[PDB]
Amino acid sequence: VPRMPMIWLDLKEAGDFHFQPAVKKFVLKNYGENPEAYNEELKKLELLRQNAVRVPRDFEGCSVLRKYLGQLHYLQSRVPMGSGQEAAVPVTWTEIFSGKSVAHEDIKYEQACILYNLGALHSMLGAMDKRVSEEGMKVSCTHFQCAAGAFAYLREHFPQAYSVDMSRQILTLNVNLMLGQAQECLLEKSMLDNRKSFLVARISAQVVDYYKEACRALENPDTASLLGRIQKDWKKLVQMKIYYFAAVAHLHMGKQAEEQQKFGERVAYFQSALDKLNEAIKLAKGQPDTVQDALRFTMDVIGGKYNSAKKDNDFIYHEAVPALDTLQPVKGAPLVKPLPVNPTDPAVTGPDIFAKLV
C-alpha cells in the first residue's frame, strides 16, 4: 500500500545574539571578577549556538538543539538576560511567514525559537521517512508526537507570542496537524499488525478528527492570512485526507460487518467508503503522484470490496441495505499525545557550561 506524504515545518533562520559583552560586564559589575576570566565558557556557548542555528537536519541534530536550549536556561539562571533585565541584549530571528527580522531584548525569545526549531526538526524527521515497516511507522509517530510536544510547550509557556509564527492559533494548528500525522502512522501500523477491523475503524476515525481540527484553522480567514501561500498547499492535502481516512474508517466498518455476516450492512459501509473516497479523489487534483498512487490503490481495494459485497447481496443474501443514519457512528480512538520536553534534563545538556560562575 502506497503511503500518503506528510507535512513538515521549516526551521526558523537565526540572526545575531551578541551575549558576550553583556555577560562580561555583569561578571565585572555583579560577581566582582575579571571580565576576561570566562572567555572559555563564552567561547563554548558561542560554538554551541553556531552548531544549533546551523543544525544538521538529522536525528543527532535533535540533541544539539536540546543541549543548547538547556545551556540557555543555565545561563539565564546566572546572568539576567530576560525582558527588562540588566544584561539583556537584542535577539533577532526571522519570522517564517513574512521572512522579516523580528528582534526582542530577551533571552527567552532565543529559547523559544530554539524550541520551535526542535519541533520543526522532529516534524521533518517524521515526514522524510518512507514508513515501509512497523518500526518506521512507530519512529515517525514518535517524531510527530515530539513535534506536537515542542509546539504545545511553546504555546503553554510563551502565551504572549514573540512573532506570529509562534502565536497561539498557529501553534494550535501545528499541534493538531502533528497529532493527526502521528495517529495516521499508528493507523498504518494497526493494519500491519492485523488489529480487529472495528478498532482500525476507530483509529482512522480519530485521524479524521485531528485533521478536521487542523483544517478548521486552515479555513480560518485570519489564521490563513498569517500563513500566506503555504495555507493553500496544506489545506489541499489536509482536506483530501479528511475524506480519505473517513473512507478508510468506513472500509473497516464494512469489514467488521463481513465478519459478523451482516451482508446488507457490508454493502452500506462499502458504498459510503466509495462515496467518501471519490470526494478525496476530486480534492486531490494537482497533487503529487505519492497521493495519486495512494488513492488509486485504495480505489482498487474499496471498489473491489464494494462490487463483491453488492454481488453477494444481490444474488444470494438479498438483505436490506441499512440507511447509514441508522448505524452507530464510529467514535475516534485517540492513541497519541504531545510528548513533554524537559529543557534542563542533565542527560541532554551535559555539565552546566557556566558552573564556575558563582
Add this chain to the structure above:
Amino acid sequence: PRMPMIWLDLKEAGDFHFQPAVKKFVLKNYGENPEAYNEELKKLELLRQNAVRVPRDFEGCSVLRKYLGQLHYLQSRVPMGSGQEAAVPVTWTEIFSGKSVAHEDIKYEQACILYNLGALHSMLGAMDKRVSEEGMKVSCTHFQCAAGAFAYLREHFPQAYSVDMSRQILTLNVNLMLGQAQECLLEKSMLDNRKSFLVARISAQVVDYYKEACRALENPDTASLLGRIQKDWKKLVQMKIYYFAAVAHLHMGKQAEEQQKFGERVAYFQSALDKLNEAIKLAKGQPDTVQDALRFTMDVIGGKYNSAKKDNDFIYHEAVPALDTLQPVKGAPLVKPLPVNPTDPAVTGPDIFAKLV
C-alpha cells in the same frame, strides 16, 4: 572528621491489582483475547515485586527507575489514571502515620516509586564514610539525585496524594538533600586545596540550605507531622548551621592571612570561635561522631585564633574590625536537584507493553 548525614525511609507498598483491569480493557476496546498479554502482565508483576522489596544498593536504584518507566509505558496504552476507565485501587502506607492511603490512580503508584527512589538515594548518600574524594563525589551525586526525585514529585504532583508528599514537606526534603550534597563538596574542596575564599563561599552555601530546612522544621505543621523526627532533624541541622558558619569564617580569616590583613584575620577567627561555641552548645547529646568533629575543629580554630591574636598584639598592631563590620560571605551554589526522566530508554529497557495498542 565527617559529620553524620540524614536519610529518609522508604514507603511500604500495598496492593496494585492491575491485571484484571488490563485484561478487561483489552477485551472491550481492542476486541482481543484478554489472555493474549499474560506474558507482559507477568513481567510487570515481577518487576513490581522486585521494586517494592528493593535491595538497598546502587542496583536497587536501577530497579526503581526501570519499574517507574514501565508504569509510564503502561499508562500510555491503558487509561488507569484518576477517573479513567481501567483505573484500580493503589495502596501505600503513609510514612509518618503508618496509615494506609488509597487512590484509584496509577499516578499514585508512580509517585510512591519516585518517592522511594529519592529515599534510597538519601540512604546510599548517607551510608558512605566519605574517606576519599571518590566517596565524596558519589555521596554528593546521591544527595543531588535524592533532591531531584523529591523536586520532580513537588513539581508534577502539586496536589499531594498524602501528607508525606505535601509541597511543604517535599521542599524540606529537597533543601536537606541539597545542603548535604553541598556539604560533601565542601569536604572535597578542602581535600582539593581550593582557594580559601572559595572554600568559605562553599561553606556559607551549606549554611544557606540548612537555614531553609531549619525554617521548614520550625513550622508547627511540620512538627506535628514529623513528631520526634522533627526534633532529631532540627537539632542536627541547627548545629550544622553554626558549624558551617564557623568553617566559613575560618576560611575568610585564612584569606585575610593571605592578603596581610592581620586585624581582619583576628576578627574572622574570633567570629569563627563564637559560632563554633554555639555549635558545641547545640550539639549536646549528639554522638561522638559529632563531638569528635567539633573538638578537632575547635583545636584548629582555637590555634589559628591564638596565633593571629599573638601576631597582632605583639607585631602588626592593626585595628580589629567589629564583627558587625565583617562583610557577609555570599554562598556559592555548586549543587542542584538532578531530575529524572521517567522514560529514559537507558533506564527502562524495552517497552514491556510494546505489543499493546
